[PDB]
Design a protein around this nucleic acid. Structure first.
Ligand SMILES: [Mg+2]
Ligand SMILES: [Mg+2]
Ligand SMILES: [Mg+2]
Ligand SMILES: [Mg+2]
Ligand SMILES: [Mg+2]
Ligand SMILES: [Mg+2]
Ligand SMILES: [Mg+2]
Ligand SMILES: [Mg+2]
Ligand SMILES: [Mg+2]
Ligand SMILES: [Mg+2]
Ligand SMILES: [Mg+2]
Ligand SMILES: [Mg+2]
Ligand SMILES: [Mg+2]
Ligand SMILES: [Mg+2]
Ligand SMILES: [Mg+2]
Ligand SMILES: [Mg+2]
Lengths: 370, 205, 86
RNA sequence: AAUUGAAGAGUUUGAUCAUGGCUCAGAUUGAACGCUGGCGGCAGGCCUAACACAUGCAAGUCGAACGGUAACAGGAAGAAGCUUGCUUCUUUGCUGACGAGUGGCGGACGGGUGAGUAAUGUCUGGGAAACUGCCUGAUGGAGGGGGAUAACUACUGGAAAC
RNA sequence: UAGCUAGUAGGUGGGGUAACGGCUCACCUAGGCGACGAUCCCUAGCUGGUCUGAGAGGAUGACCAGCCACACUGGAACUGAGACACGGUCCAGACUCCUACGGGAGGCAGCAGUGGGGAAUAUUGCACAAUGGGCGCAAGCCUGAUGCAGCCAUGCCGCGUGUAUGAAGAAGGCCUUCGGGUUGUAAAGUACUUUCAGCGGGGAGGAAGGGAGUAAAGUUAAUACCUUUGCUCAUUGACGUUACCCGCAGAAGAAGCACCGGCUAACUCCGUGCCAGCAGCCGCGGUAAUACGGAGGGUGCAAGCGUUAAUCGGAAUUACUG
RNA sequence: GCCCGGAUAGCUCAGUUGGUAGAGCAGGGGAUUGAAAAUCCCCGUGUCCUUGGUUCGAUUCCGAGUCCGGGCACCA
């Protein structure tokens, strides 16, 4: 009825969110437990849901609203769905490049997974809030001035670190952690790639770059699509100063990613997915589609390029079948040693054709007698 | 390419000493040279004419360490060449670089010589030769390079050679570990037990 | 025609063909006048025709349309015929 | 100096010699299948369907043949926010060059296959009635007129092909 | 397959061709081919060669090279020096594709590749660096020619898989006249070496040309420009972690297939029972099988070995030699 | 994808919503020959496709997976 009133996409989306909240043990321990642990989500039938990215996006906004609410109430399952969200949804969001939603998720999770460290690094952040904010507005001041004077225009601002990521840096830098330097971050968001390179040069004229801490993620984008320049200069009172230069478009993609302790699911020209067993061939696929097609199946294309009939189909890759007008299956297809048909059904179908072309006795006799 | 196995078994099968072991300690004491190899060694076989020829062929092949195809090729070459065919074949076999080395006394056995050749120990006219089958022509000097001179194995081989008979067609120096191939070895130089004619016949049937 | 060159050649050929046909056809017509005259039995007329056409034939030969030898041949035959006539 | 090359065997019979077939021992391959299986070098690799063909590439080049500039990099005349010095936006084949075109030469070579052909074939040998771009050697000309035509432009017929 | 053939054989003249010619037409003569095989049928590219063979022959024609023919089938011409043109044109046909249904497009027997057929034959690789070709005055661009690379033991050839020593003739394996004798100096142990493989380094040759500057000579009114000849200057590598050399560690990672009655090299020991199986031929197997299956032992070859197919050989068994 | 049918001595087949399985040939074993054929005797000589269920008891009935034989649907 969703499908009748809001098309096949919206029902696919509703059904994927229902899958990966797997109410299975959402109620079922009712402390939300298969919201939590996939426990093989609805099995590997996670790997028979719809891949449409709006699944993960409505799942993430759903869980984010929930973590807001899991500041307030039910106590110990504040604990449960926080462990799910650390271990699953925050690093999912991150390997999608939805950094905004990773950092909110992580801060909610961490503040009811370890309240002592959440509270201790929160309080520490106040203790040097002023020397930090003053030194950020002096750095942003100098940069705003010299660059504006040189005829370049961009946003230049400080950005707080988020509590989970301070914690993170504090125990991969213990006793060389600096509450000041390590919690400053200048960002520059420029109009053009041109202006990113320009702001890089002017920054480097004002304050000397440190050797080995200059890192061009615009030239080499990270796997979740993250692009910026990073540089650490040596600022006027901060023997490191961290600076992230990018365009607007690359800030939008960096904060908002994708939104900008058996079987093989093969796509088809349109998109209607076909399910074969693991180790299947083009021939098998063809047969599945239609036995007549299989009979008349000349050549197998995969993603544009031609493939050998013997080569097995990988999961997800898109197929095309070049076809004749007459049906002509080879007797070689039946023979399993060549590696043409892994499926039984397909083989049977193939066989049938030959028998048709061709066009007990005792039992019959007995019957007659009777 | 080579026979990786019991050296003296072959000798036993043949009957005669093939020189497949150095000769520090004698062949008669090492193995039961009189008896043929296997369970039915004492059973003396009534050997056919073809059989005898085959045996002869084997013996020669064994002696040099020349497998069948190679041997055949050599025979063909000999035939192509002018004069006595068997003699030519024999000469060719001798001319094998490893064989030459062995004769000189840098290999105790021919196998050893072959190994040395393989392992870039030997040089011909100031040029390294990896290949055991290399035909050493007249007036071609053959030596060991300075990196392989310091081996005790070589010394041992030399000693063995000294103990044994000297070839006429070769000249050799013990201290320098080098020598000279003067001319092609005649039939009188080689051993008289090798009936080359039989071998020739066998490659005419 | 898969290759640009072929296409060009093809159109050029068509154009060339049209051109040559016109010239060749004209030449043929001219020849026929002479031949016609010969058939009739009018010697002066025939001669006149020959005069009219021979130069054209020569020109054509020069151009390449008709081969030099071919051009010569027509003249020879025509010359022979006219001689025979008178 | 340049073919210096020629082996038999088993099996007809109670046994023999002979005729006589079948048959094995050799060499060989564009080979395949089987069991294996380290490497190198040099070679070879749809013999059958001259059966069907998706995809890319396999013949283009010449701007020093010619009008032209469809992208580009330079100058040239003008001007915009004027960092007192040129970044920049407009125009013009003026130039390096070049889309598309006309023209030239090349697409008749190179590559493929062996279907057809027992001779408008091939091999060898002889010929006479021939043409032969570029390359070539020689001897003489290259004067002076035309009208076209793409290209490019408007209005249009076609889904496209055109 | 004994008769065949009317443009058929020849002639005169016309026409045509680049050229001679029934090449084609008009008219005439009635021939021409043929049992030295015409005709018709079947098969077939042909040659250099290849294999085999003592030769003579026989078989054969992948690769490389020459010549011919063909380019989805059947035509036809056009252009051109040259084609009746693989990646040109025109038409028809069958066959795939596109189409707004009116009409279009297409042609791997180019190189890759896919399907199919098959017993069976490779990667949609890189490059023009060379050699050759195209164009151009050149630079240059194109070149699936070519050069190289990948895959497959398909072949040939080479090389390796350790070398020397080593009796307790160890153990285990198999036989066994029960003593051993065989595996077998084989292994282990000891010494010695490092082919190729592995790592790290170095490191030619295939590269001759071309480009700028110059100086001289050859041209011309002219020391310009152009061409020719010298010279320095930086250059030009697809293959390419190239060939090739060195150092490191350590036997380390590198033996298998057939055969074993006679032919035919190599033999002993079971189950069974004319069964199962073997087999190239003769023939083995009907309760003691050197022939079947295994084990050991051997023999042959060896990174191959066998089987099968196919040819010559042997087969003087088409004999020309003979 | 779905259904229906079939899967029993060596091998032909017989027996079914439930009572420990036969007919032919083949095979055995004896007499008998060297062994046979003939002749003469005597003899089932079986994983009912495997694994579970139902039952007082399963070849059979229900699953569950296999295998084969259909007959149906499917056009990326
Ligand atoms: Mg097949
Ligand atoms: Mg070899
Ligand atoms: Mg005439
Ligand atoms: Mg294999
Ligand atoms: Mg151009
Ligand atoms: Mg005539
Ligand atoms: Mg043919
Ligand atoms: Mg002969
Ligand atoms: Mg044609
Ligand atoms: Mg012409
Ligand atoms: Mg083509
Ligand atoms: Mg023992
Ligand atoms: Mg090496
Ligand atoms: Mg024997
Ligand atoms: Mg056998
Ligand atoms: Mg003969």
């Amino acid at each position: 009825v969703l499908r009748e009133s809001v098309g096949k996409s919206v029902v696919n989306l509703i059904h994927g969110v229902r899958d990966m909240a797997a109410i299975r043990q959402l109620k079922a321990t009712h402390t939300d437990s298969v919201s939590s642990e996939q426990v093989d989500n609805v099995r590997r039938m996670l790997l028979a849901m719809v891949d449409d990215f709006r699944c993960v996006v409505i799942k993430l906004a759903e869980r984010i609203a929930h973590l807001r609410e899991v500041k307030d109430a039910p106590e110990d399952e504040r604990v449960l769905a926080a462990k799910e969200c650390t271990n699953i949804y925050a690093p999912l969001a991150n390997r999608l490049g939805i950094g905004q939603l990773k950092w909110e998720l992580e801060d909610y999770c961490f503040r009811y997974l370890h309240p002592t460290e959440y509270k201790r690094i929160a309080k520490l952040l106040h203790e040097r809030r002023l020397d930090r904010e003053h030194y950020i507005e002096e750095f942003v001041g100098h940069l705003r001035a010299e660059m504006k004077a040189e005829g370049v225009k961009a946003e230049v601002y400080g950005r707080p670190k988020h509590i989970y990521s301070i914690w993170r840096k504090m125990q991969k830098k213990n006793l060389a952690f600096d509450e000041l330097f390590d919690v400053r971050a200048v960002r520059i968001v420029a109009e053009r790639l041109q202006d990113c390179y320009a702001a890089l040069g002017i920054v480097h004229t004002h304050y000397r770059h440190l050797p080995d801490e200059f890192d061009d993620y615009v030239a080499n984008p990270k796997p979740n699509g993250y692009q910026s320049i990073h540089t650490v200069v040596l600022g006027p009172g901060g023997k490191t100063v961290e600076i992230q230069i990018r365009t607007k478009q690359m800030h939008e993609d960096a904060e908002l990613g994708v939104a900008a302790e058996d079987r093989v699911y093969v796509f088809t020209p349109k998109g209607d997915v076909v399910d074969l067993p693991a180790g299947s061939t083009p021939l098998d696929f063809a047969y599945h589609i239609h036995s007549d097609v299989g009979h008349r199946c000349i050549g197998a294309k995969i993603g544009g390029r031609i493939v050998p009939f013997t080569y097995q189909l990988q999961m997800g890759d898109q197929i095309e079948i070049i076809t004749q007008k007459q049906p002509n299956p080879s007797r070689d297809w039946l023979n399993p040693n060549l590696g043409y048909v892994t499926t039984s059904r397909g083989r049977s179908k193939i066989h049938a054709w030959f028998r048709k072309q061709d066009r007990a006795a005792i039992g019959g006799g007995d019957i007659r007698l009777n | 390419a080579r026979y990786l196995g019991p050296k003296l078994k072959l000798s036993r099968r043949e009957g005669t000493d093939l020189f497949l072991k150095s000769g520090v300690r004698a062949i008669d004491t090492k193995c039961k040279i009189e008896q043929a190899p296997g369970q039915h060694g004492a059973r003396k076989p009534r050997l056919s004419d073809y059989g005898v020829q085959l045996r002869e062929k084997q013996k020669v092949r064994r002696i040099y360490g020349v497998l069948e195809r190679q041997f055949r090729n050599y025979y063909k070459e000999a035939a192509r060449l002018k004069g006595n065919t068997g003699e030519n074949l024999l000469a060719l076999l001798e001319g094998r670089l490893d064989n030459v080395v062995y004769r000189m006394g840098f290999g105790a056995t021919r196998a050893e010589a072959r190994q040395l050749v393989s392992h870039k120990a030997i040089m011909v006219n100031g040029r390294v030769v990896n290949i055991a089958s290399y035909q050493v022509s007249p007036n071609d000097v053959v030596s060991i390079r300075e990196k392989a001179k310091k081996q005790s194995r070589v010394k041992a081989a030399l000693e063995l050679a000294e103990q044994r008979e000297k070839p006429t067609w070769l000249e050799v120096d013990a201290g320098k570990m080098e020598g000279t191939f003067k001319r092609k070895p005649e039939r009188s130089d080689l051993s008289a037990d090798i009936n080359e004619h039989l071998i020739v016949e066998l490659y005419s049937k | 025609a898969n290759i640009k060159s072929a296409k060009k050649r093809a159109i050029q050929s068509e154009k060339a063909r049209k051109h040559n046909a016109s010239r060749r056809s004209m030449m043929r017509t001219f020849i026929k006048k002479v031949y016609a005259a010969i058939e009739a039995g009018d010697k002066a007329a025939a001669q006149k025709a020959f005069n009219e056409m021979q130069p054209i034939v020569d020109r054509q030969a020069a151009k390449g349309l008709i081969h030099k030898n071919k051009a010569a041949r027509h003249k020879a035959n025509l010359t022979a015929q006219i001689n025979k006539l008178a």
